[PDB]
Amino acid sequence: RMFKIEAAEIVVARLPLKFRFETSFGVQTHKVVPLLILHGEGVQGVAEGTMEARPMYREETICGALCLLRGTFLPAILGQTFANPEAVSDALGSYRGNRMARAMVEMAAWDLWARTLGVPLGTLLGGHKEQVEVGVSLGIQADEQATVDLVRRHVEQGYRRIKLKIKPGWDVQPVRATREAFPDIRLTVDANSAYTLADAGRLRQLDEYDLTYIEQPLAWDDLVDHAELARRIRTPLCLDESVASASDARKALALGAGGVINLKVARVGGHAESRRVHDVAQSFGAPVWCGGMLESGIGRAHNIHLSTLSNFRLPGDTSSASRYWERDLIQEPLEAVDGLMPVPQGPGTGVTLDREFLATVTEAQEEHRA
Amino acid sequence: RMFKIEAAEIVVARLPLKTHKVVPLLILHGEGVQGVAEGTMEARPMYREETICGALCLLRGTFLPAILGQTFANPEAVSDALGSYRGNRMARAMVEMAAWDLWARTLGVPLGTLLGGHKEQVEVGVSLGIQADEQATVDLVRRHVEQGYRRIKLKIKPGWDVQPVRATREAFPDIRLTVDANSAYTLADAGRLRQLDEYDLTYIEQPLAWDDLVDHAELARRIRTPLCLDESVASASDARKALALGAGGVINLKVARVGGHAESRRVHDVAQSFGAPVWCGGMLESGIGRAHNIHLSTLSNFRLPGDTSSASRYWERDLIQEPLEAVDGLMPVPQGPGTGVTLDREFLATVTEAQEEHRA
Amino acid sequence: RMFKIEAAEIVVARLPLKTHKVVPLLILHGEGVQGVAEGTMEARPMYREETICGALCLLRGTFLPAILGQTFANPEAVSDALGSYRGNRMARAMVEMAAWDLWARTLGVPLGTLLGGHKEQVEVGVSLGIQADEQATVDLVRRHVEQGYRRIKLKIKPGWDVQPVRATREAFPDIRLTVDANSAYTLADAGRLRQLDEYDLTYIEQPLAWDDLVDHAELARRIRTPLCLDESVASASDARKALALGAGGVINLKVARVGGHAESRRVHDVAQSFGAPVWCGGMLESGIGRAHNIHLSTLSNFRLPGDTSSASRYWERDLIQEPLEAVDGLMPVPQGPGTGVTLDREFLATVTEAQEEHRA
Amino acid sequence: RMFKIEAAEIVVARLPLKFRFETSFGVQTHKVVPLLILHGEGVQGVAEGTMEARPMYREETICGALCLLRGTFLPAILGQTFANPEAVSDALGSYRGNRMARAMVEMAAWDLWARTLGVPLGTLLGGHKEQVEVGVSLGIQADEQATVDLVRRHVEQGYRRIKLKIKPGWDVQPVRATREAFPDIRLTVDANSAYTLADAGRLRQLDEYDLTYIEQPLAWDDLVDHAELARRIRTPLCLDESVASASDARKALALGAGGVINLKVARVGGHAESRRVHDVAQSFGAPVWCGGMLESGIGRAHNIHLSTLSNFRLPGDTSSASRYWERDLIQEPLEAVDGLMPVPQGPGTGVTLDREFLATVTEAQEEHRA
Ligand SMILES: CC(=O)N[C@@H](CCC(N)=O)C(=O)O
Ligand SMILES: CC(=O)N[C@@H](CCC(N)=O)C(=O)O
Ligand SMILES: [Mg+2]
Ligand SMILES: [Mg+2]
Ligand SMILES: [Mg+2]
Ligand SMILES: [Mg+2]
């Protein structure tokens, strides 16, 4: 039955990384993890923000999102009783944008709700996969052959897709040079919203090298130019930043802006909207796959449960947690073997904050009540 | 945790109208609860392609042996365990919808709540058949407007369309008014249908072929009145194709026609992503089907009124213990887990023509 | 020659309306002059996605450290020095617009003149909220017509649109009349919106989703009244896409929403290249923002009247020393270099909630 | 503040060339340079006409343009006070066409105005590049290999694009034969409004040889056929003659007539309109690059300042002045090194008439006052 949200904790942690993540919007080495914990009916839901300190991947920031949480979202929900996560989400007024901020509340609500039922999260969302295929995305690196080697280390691990982050002045080389050593691997690029329609003919060269897709080659907020570019090349386009809702997905696919969607749960505003994005794509015969945002095991586990839905037909960016952190914020390991990630068992996300360890890396912590 | 389907009953009832109606039921048993669903296929293929005879064959020979004795994580897993077979969406909906009801009852949660709805009441419309003349049409619309219905549906046909719509809109300038064209028209009728445009109908329902989308798209370019699709939307990919082709701007969503609740929610979500509304169509359901419908209707893109009016308008006495009665054009969501309604087993037995039990 | 940005102040004022409004200001100091700009983001994300809290964070932690102590050839160079970051156009506009004002003041040249304008006065329109009934609408339009406004904007909403427009056009057959639909409609409203067509509105402003262009394109095919875009044009490439898709024929151009003066001139020029007009939208600005707006509005494709009406309509007392008062629907361009207006520092201090200074 | 135009000089010079310019509209060896000097507020603005004695590249002529200047344009502006170059341009009535003639006035006005402010021209137009990438365009020449050698001399100089003027009965050869010796150079052709849609399949052969664009292959005044041809070949089209305004640019790009625009400042009517053309292209994600019209250092310097704007993303035709003249009309050298041309320093254009030398090559000179 119904659930009452009695308290909310905001806990910000920073976690040292392991590899250096050198995307076309910059280089990333460390990681701030904004956690929202919702309390009610003797259980708790935890979710993790995917917004950055500065607006580099997309428009939101930790600073603005916490203001929004403490000044607006949390007051609207605290002390209130809800029938389900859709009602929580409904209660956050008509505020514009800020999907990731909304996702912290909404996804925590899903975790809390599932835990009141004693049911796994993926199960309530309609998924019945018991593990999910994952690939790896490899940041920018080295040179023509001396990067066919980092691919090597991952193909030997059984990862089911290799994604190379390219960018203006570094692209066609690895692709032929990886299709070189590995003529048969599922291979993709993250063209990193780097290019413009100007760069169209160069991108067509990637065509023979048989990629499953080219990811977000043009502006992060664009659909129209992508639809133009898609007509000029044979390699399918994959959208990321430009699909932030199910109607964006509908428009992108009706326009022909892409044939594949990188679905990032928090980017589209949470699980319910992700299911819609997922079903909209499916109705167009377009697959989705699960994006990653360097999450701790909270975010990683949310991603894994979402990925159990049936239109997740391409390997996601949900590789092994041990790849990123010497120690994660949860107790459970989230380790893929042979490119298959198992669904962590238990109610909701199936994972559990390591509170003692979290405390040692916490830099902010607030409680909110009605 | 997961649920095992241990047993299934098929009960075929002949329920007196207020002539009879054959009501096929499926009851799935597991975990100390049961799920019940109602078939909407007819004895002969009239509204669509399926029949009771073909459907019950498929259930007992194929669908039921596939699920009996198996353990499932959710209703989607039950449905997936049947996905090799083509079409037969109403037969499939029987299993799928009973599975939803069973699953919800293992959790103790209302069905609509599990599907993501949070309405406590749903808006209901009324359907009128062809009347003898204009004033007889207007007198019955006036009755139903006074009862508080929030949408008026008129059955129209070639020779009788502009007249009743005109007379009605004249008497009732501001009501929500729609028509059901019952696939009785052709593209040569475009000029006549366009004559409806000045009376601001919310939509015209399925004027052209029952399985068509493409000619509906053409007709939509020729008239300004929105088209509502019925029989040609039997899946989420049909809804996508319909909306993207401009075959219509509204979908009459019938849960069993598209294959059950999960696929219905996908139709609802696809429509929503296009900013097109859906509404809940009806099929003369006993309280089992009516309750499944009321629960589906609590979802937020059900933005036009549905054919889930009072059970008492159809049946002397219903097969369930709970009254489903709308007041002032609002049907309350029946309280309880799953559908929130309960078969009256003794009354049921007095109207049962045939029953059978199946185990693994 | 080039300019060095030596210092920046953020002042947040609470300015009494004639209830209060929070007015965030940025003052950039260099070369013995200063540039001032005003933020248009709200405390919560209502008109669009940004907030004062998020914006000020971005300024002090990112934008300001990027420019403090650096030397620039022009305001475009200042803006380029921030181009790694995504969205946040109003936060960016604060820096960009102060940079324009500073730059113009190092040269001794009016801002509008540097952007290529040569109007000495700009035409102003009036905005009316929902009134109780038709005659109350007409009485207020009559007032504003007599004051000499050159465009009447009516706020409309579902249930209240054709009536006020009809009553107004009936009383005023030749005035320039427009409506603001405030994203309150859907494609199902096409038939109702088309009913506005006979009253010859100059445009309907953003009837569908605030961030949409594609559905607006569809709606434009269904009705003959021109659509004006607001929130879905946040850049020159948005303006191009909007005009080329046929999402609208007019753009409500708000300087801070698109990221400042340079990008605004690009929106203005793209529109012009399509032969589509722009007009200057408003955001309840203190005299700082109003003056930036008046200066932008002097450009030649600002061919419909703008929301830069009298400061006295909003504020008991303004933050600047100069009165910005329109007479007979003409707002004079404030004289002087840059914006031609000057902060009243002592009055400002009496209404300051928070201030801070930043250096390299 | 405001500026008053008190006097105007028209000075026509002829300058001996150095190389023979053998375009598909004819062979050019010498060069008439129409200069307009505007006087006001103790400074002067100088601009240079790009119209020819005869209408070979486009429709204007020196003869008709000077008539228009002396009979119409100059009378409208002399003794008048203006707030900026846009107001000067506004004051030249609604006269039709004659963009180059208008450009002499307008561009001189920009120079004059910038000089009253003491600011560089490019700076006022919004550019902040400190030098610009340039290529070379090579007229019609020799044969298959014995022209891969003239390309040679330019690649050794570091020019960042090589453009070959082709024409019916001389085209596919050098391209494979230059892509031959120089498999990696940025290479283009100036198809010289020579062809018609008839010639479409031959042009598609240039496709593998990897040109950045094919320039104005069809009629000089056409958009529609270019949009058709663009659909038949993979090499982007570049428009020149057919874009004479920002609305022409809008129409060309909305139609798909080209993906690149050769922006010639005087052809579109001056700096302000060039900025608009530049921004319109940018809004479509189309680059521009700077055309050349064999200018003396006055025109060359105007071109360099315009080229500082951000959508000038492809190398222009603004090579070294020493390539064209044994002596230029200005004092300053305008020499590129390694395909980079520096912005000449100083207010306005940053260059200065060499009046003593100009006098020795002047063939006409008039003063006009109010
Ligand atoms: C922080 C986020 O922007 N980083 C990666 C995703 C990293 C993934 N492997 O977890 C990205 O490509 O978006
Ligand atoms: C006079 C003009 O028509 N000649 C060259 C441009 C020459 C450039 N290199 O300066 C052209 O191709 O148009
Ligand atoms: Mg990515
Ligand atoms: Mg019906
Ligand atoms: Mg408005
Ligand atoms: Mg040329």
GROMACS .gro file of N, CA, C and O in nm, chain A residues 254-314:
model
  244
  254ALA      N    1   1.128   0.993  -3.517
  254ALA     CA    2   1.041   1.032  -3.628
  254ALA      C    3   1.117   1.114  -3.733
  254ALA      O    4   1.089   1.103  -3.853
  255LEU      N    5   1.213   1.194  -3.686
  255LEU     CA    6   1.298   1.276  -3.772
  255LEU      C    7   1.405   1.196  -3.845
  255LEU      O    8   1.459   1.239  -3.947
  256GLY      N    9   1.440   1.081  -3.788
  256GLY     CA   10   1.553   1.005  -3.840
  256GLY      C   11   1.687   1.061  -3.791
  256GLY      O   12   1.788   1.047  -3.859
  257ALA      N   13   1.689   1.120  -3.672
  257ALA     CA   14   1.815   1.172  -3.615
  257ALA      C   15   1.911   1.062  -3.571
  257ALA      O   16   2.032   1.084  -3.563
  258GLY      N   17   1.856   0.945  -3.538
  258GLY     CA   18   1.938   0.830  -3.501
  258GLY      C   19   1.860   0.701  -3.514
  258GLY      O   20   1.738   0.704  -3.531
  259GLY      N   21   1.931   0.588  -3.505
  259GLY     CA   22   1.869   0.455  -3.503
  259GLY      C   23   1.887   0.383  -3.370
  259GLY      O   24   1.833   0.275  -3.347
  260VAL      N   25   1.964   0.445  -3.281
  260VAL     CA   26   1.995   0.387  -3.153
  260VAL      C   27   1.992   0.496  -3.049
  260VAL      O   28   2.029   0.609  -3.076
  261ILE      N   29   1.946   0.463  -2.928
  261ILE     CA   30   1.951   0.561  -2.821
  261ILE      C   31   2.034   0.508  -2.703
  261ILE      O   32   2.011   0.398  -2.654
  262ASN      N   33   2.135   0.586  -2.664
  262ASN     CA   34   2.201   0.571  -2.536
  262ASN      C   35   2.105   0.622  -2.429
  262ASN      O   36   2.082   0.741  -2.418
  263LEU      N   37   2.046   0.530  -2.353
  263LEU     CA   38   1.952   0.569  -2.248
  263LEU      C   39   2.024   0.585  -2.115
  263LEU      O   40   2.073   0.487  -2.056
  264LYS      N   41   2.031   0.710  -2.067
  264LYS     CA   42   2.084   0.737  -1.934
  264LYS      C   43   1.971   0.773  -1.839
  264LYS      O   44   1.906   0.877  -1.854
  265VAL      N   45   1.950   0.687  -1.740
  265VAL     CA   46   1.832   0.695  -1.654
  265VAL      C   47   1.812   0.835  -1.591
  265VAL      O   48   1.702   0.890  -1.594
  266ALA      N   49   1.918   0.892  -1.537
  266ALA     CA   50   1.905   1.017  -1.466
  266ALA      C   51   1.891   1.133  -1.565
  266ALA      O   52   1.824   1.232  -1.537
  267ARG      N   53   1.954   1.119  -1.682
  267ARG     CA   54   1.946   1.221  -1.786
  267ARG      C   55   1.802   1.245  -1.834
  267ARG      O   56   1.767   1.358  -1.867
  268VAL      N   57   1.721   1.138  -1.841
  268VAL     CA   58   1.581   1.151  -1.884
  268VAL      C   59   1.483   1.171  -1.766
  268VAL      O   60   1.363   1.179  -1.787
  269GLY      N   61   1.536   1.179  -1.645
  269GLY     CA   62   1.452   1.210  -1.529
  269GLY      C   63   1.406   1.091  -1.446
  269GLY      O   64   1.316   1.105  -1.364
  270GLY      N   65   1.468   0.975  -1.464
  270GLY     CA   66   1.438   0.862  -1.375
  270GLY      C   67   1.386   0.737  -1.444
  270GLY      O   68   1.382   0.730  -1.566
  271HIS      N   69   1.346   0.638  -1.364
  271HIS     CA   70   1.311   0.505  -1.416
  271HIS      C   71   1.185   0.503  -1.501
  271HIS      O   72   1.184   0.446  -1.609
  272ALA      N   73   1.078   0.564  -1.451
  272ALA     CA   74   0.951   0.563  -1.522
  272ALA      C   75   0.968   0.625  -1.659
  272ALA      O   76   0.922   0.570  -1.760
  273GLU      N   77   1.034   0.740  -1.665
  273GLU     CA   78   1.055   0.803  -1.796
  273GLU      C   79   1.150   0.723  -1.884
  273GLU      O   80   1.139   0.727  -2.006
  274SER      N   81   1.244   0.651  -1.822
  274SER     CA   82   1.337   0.566  -1.898
  274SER      C   83   1.263   0.450  -1.962
  274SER      O   84   1.288   0.415  -2.077
  275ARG      N   85   1.172   0.389  -1.887
  275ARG     CA   86   1.086   0.286  -1.944
  275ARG      C   87   1.009   0.340  -2.065
  275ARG      O   88   0.992   0.269  -2.165
  276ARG      N   89   0.963   0.465  -2.057
  276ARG     CA   90   0.888   0.524  -2.169
  276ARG      C   91   0.980   0.544  -2.288
  276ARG      O   92   0.947   0.506  -2.400
  277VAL      N   93   1.097   0.603  -2.263
  277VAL     CA   94   1.198   0.620  -2.368
  277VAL      C   95   1.228   0.486  -2.436
  277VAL      O   96   1.228   0.476  -2.560
  278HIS      N   97   1.254   0.385  -2.352
  278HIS     CA   98   1.274   0.245  -2.392
  278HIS      C   99   1.160   0.187  -2.479
  278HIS      O  100   1.186   0.121  -2.580
  279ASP      N  101   1.035   0.211  -2.440
  279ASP     CA  102   0.919   0.161  -2.515
  279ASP      C  103   0.893   0.240  -2.642
  279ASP      O  104   0.852   0.185  -2.743
  280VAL      N  105   0.914   0.371  -2.636
  280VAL     CA  106   0.902   0.454  -2.755
  280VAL      C  107   1.002   0.407  -2.861
  280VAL      O  108   0.963   0.379  -2.973
  281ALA      N  109   1.129   0.396  -2.825
  281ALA     CA  110   1.232   0.342  -2.915
  281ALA      C  111   1.188   0.206  -2.974
  281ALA      O  112   1.191   0.185  -3.095
  282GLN      N  113   1.147   0.115  -2.886
  282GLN     CA  114   1.103  -0.017  -2.926
  282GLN      C  115   0.992  -0.012  -3.031
  282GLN      O  116   0.993  -0.091  -3.125
  283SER      N  117   0.897   0.080  -3.014
  283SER     CA  118   0.784   0.097  -3.107
  283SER      C  119   0.829   0.145  -3.244
  283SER      O  120   0.755   0.133  -3.341
  284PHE      N  121   0.951   0.200  -3.251
  284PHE     CA  122   1.011   0.247  -3.377
  284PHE      C  123   1.109   0.143  -3.430
  284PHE      O  124   1.173   0.162  -3.535
  285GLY      N  125   1.122   0.034  -3.355
  285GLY     CA  126   1.219  -0.071  -3.387
  285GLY      C  127   1.363  -0.026  -3.369
  285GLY      O  128   1.453  -0.074  -3.437
  286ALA      N  129   1.384   0.067  -3.276
  286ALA     CA  130   1.516   0.114  -3.240
  286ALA      C  131   1.562   0.057  -3.105
  286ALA      O  132   1.489   0.062  -3.007
  287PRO      N  133   1.685   0.003  -3.099
  287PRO     CA  134   1.731  -0.047  -2.969
  287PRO      C  135   1.777   0.067  -2.878
  287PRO      O  136   1.808   0.177  -2.925
  288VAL      N  137   1.780   0.040  -2.747
  288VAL     CA  138   1.851   0.126  -2.655
  288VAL      C  139   1.962   0.044  -2.592
  288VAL      O  140   1.965  -0.080  -2.602
  289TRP      N  141   2.057   0.115  -2.533
  289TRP     CA  142   2.157   0.055  -2.449
  289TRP      C  143   2.185   0.152  -2.336
  289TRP      O  144   2.151   0.272  -2.347
  290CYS      N  145   2.242   0.100  -2.227
  290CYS     CA  146   2.256   0.173  -2.102
  290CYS      C  147   2.383   0.254  -2.095
  290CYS      O  148   2.494   0.199  -2.096
  291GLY      N  149   2.369   0.386  -2.087
  291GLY     CA  150   2.487   0.471  -2.069
  291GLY      C  151   2.545   0.465  -1.929
  291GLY      O  152   2.483   0.413  -1.837
  292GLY      N  153   2.664   0.519  -1.912
  292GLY     CA  154   2.726   0.521  -1.781
  292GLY      C  155   2.777   0.661  -1.755
  292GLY      O  156   2.807   0.734  -1.850
  293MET      N  157   2.785   0.699  -1.628
  293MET     CA  158   2.832   0.831  -1.592
  293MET      C  159   2.930   0.819  -1.478
  293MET      O  160   2.923   0.895  -1.383
  294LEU      N  161   3.020   0.720  -1.485
  294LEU     CA  162   3.117   0.694  -1.378
  294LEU      C  163   3.052   0.680  -1.239
  294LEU      O  164   3.100   0.735  -1.142
  295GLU      N  165   2.944   0.604  -1.230
  295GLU     CA  166   2.869   0.596  -1.105
  295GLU      C  167   2.933   0.508  -0.998
  295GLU      O  168   3.004   0.412  -1.029
  296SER      N  169   2.907   0.542  -0.872
  296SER     CA  170   2.932   0.450  -0.763
  296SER      C  171   2.829   0.339  -0.775
  296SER      O  172   2.743   0.340  -0.866
  297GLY      N  173   2.835   0.242  -0.684
  297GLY     CA  174   2.756   0.122  -0.697
  297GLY      C  175   2.608   0.144  -0.680
  297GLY      O  176   2.528   0.060  -0.720
  298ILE      N  177   2.571   0.256  -0.619
  298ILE     CA  178   2.432   0.297  -0.613
  298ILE      C  179   2.378   0.324  -0.754
  298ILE      O  180   2.286   0.256  -0.800
  299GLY      N  181   2.435   0.423  -0.823
  299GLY     CA  182   2.400   0.450  -0.963
  299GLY      C  183   2.418   0.327  -1.052
  299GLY      O  184   2.330   0.298  -1.132
  300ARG      N  185   2.530   0.255  -1.036
  300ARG     CA  186   2.558   0.135  -1.118
  300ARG      C  187   2.448   0.029  -1.105
  300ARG      O  188   2.405  -0.027  -1.205
  301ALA      N  189   2.400   0.008  -0.982
  301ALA     CA  190   2.295  -0.089  -0.954
  301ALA      C  191   2.158  -0.045  -1.010
  301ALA      O  192   2.083  -0.128  -1.061
  302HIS      N  193   2.126   0.084  -1.000
  302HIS     CA  194   2.007   0.137  -1.064
  302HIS      C  195   2.012   0.107  -1.215
  302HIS      O  196   1.913   0.067  -1.274
  303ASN      N  197   2.129   0.128  -1.275
  303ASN     CA  198   2.149   0.108  -1.418
  303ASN      C  199   2.129  -0.037  -1.456
  303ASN      O  200   2.067  -0.069  -1.558
  304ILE      N  201   2.182  -0.127  -1.374
  304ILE     CA  202   2.170  -0.269  -1.402
  304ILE      C  203   2.024  -0.316  -1.399
  304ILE      O  204   1.981  -0.392  -1.486
  305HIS      N  205   1.946  -0.271  -1.300
  305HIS     CA  206   1.805  -0.308  -1.296
  305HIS      C  207   1.724  -0.255  -1.415
  305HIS      O  208   1.639  -0.325  -1.470
  306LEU      N  209   1.749  -0.130  -1.452
  306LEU     CA  210   1.684  -0.075  -1.570
  306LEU      C  211   1.721  -0.158  -1.693
  306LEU      O  212   1.637  -0.185  -1.778
  307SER      N  213   1.847  -0.201  -1.700
  307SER     CA  214   1.896  -0.270  -1.820
  307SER      C  215   1.835  -0.409  -1.839
  307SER      O  216   1.857  -0.473  -1.941
  308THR      N  217   1.757  -0.454  -1.742
  308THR     CA  218   1.689  -0.583  -1.755
  308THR      C  219   1.569  -0.580  -1.850
  308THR      O  220   1.517  -0.685  -1.890
  309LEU      N  221   1.526  -0.460  -1.890
  309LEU     CA  222   1.412  -0.449  -1.982
  309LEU      C  223   1.449  -0.498  -2.123
  309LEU      O  224   1.566  -0.498  -2.161
  310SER      N  225   1.349  -0.541  -2.201
  310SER     CA  226   1.377  -0.621  -2.323
  310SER      C  227   1.436  -0.547  -2.444
  310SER      O  228   1.502  -0.609  -2.527
  311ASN      N  229   1.417  -0.415  -2.452
  311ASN     CA  230   1.473  -0.340  -2.564
  311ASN      C  231   1.616  -0.291  -2.540
  311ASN      O  232   1.673  -0.217  -2.622
  312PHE      N  233   1.674  -0.332  -2.427
  312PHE     CA  234   1.817  -0.312  -2.405
  312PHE      C  235   1.891  -0.424  -2.479
  312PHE      O  236   1.932  -0.523  -2.422
  313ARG      N  237   1.904  -0.406  -2.611
  313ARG     CA  238   1.948  -0.513  -2.701
  313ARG      C  239   2.091  -0.499  -2.742
  313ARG      O  240   2.142  -0.581  -2.817
  314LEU      N  241   2.155  -0.393  -2.694
  314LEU     CA  242   2.295  -0.368  -2.726
  314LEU      C  243   2.368  -0.354  -2.593
  314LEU      O  244   2.309  -0.309  -2.495
   0.00000   0.00000   0.00000
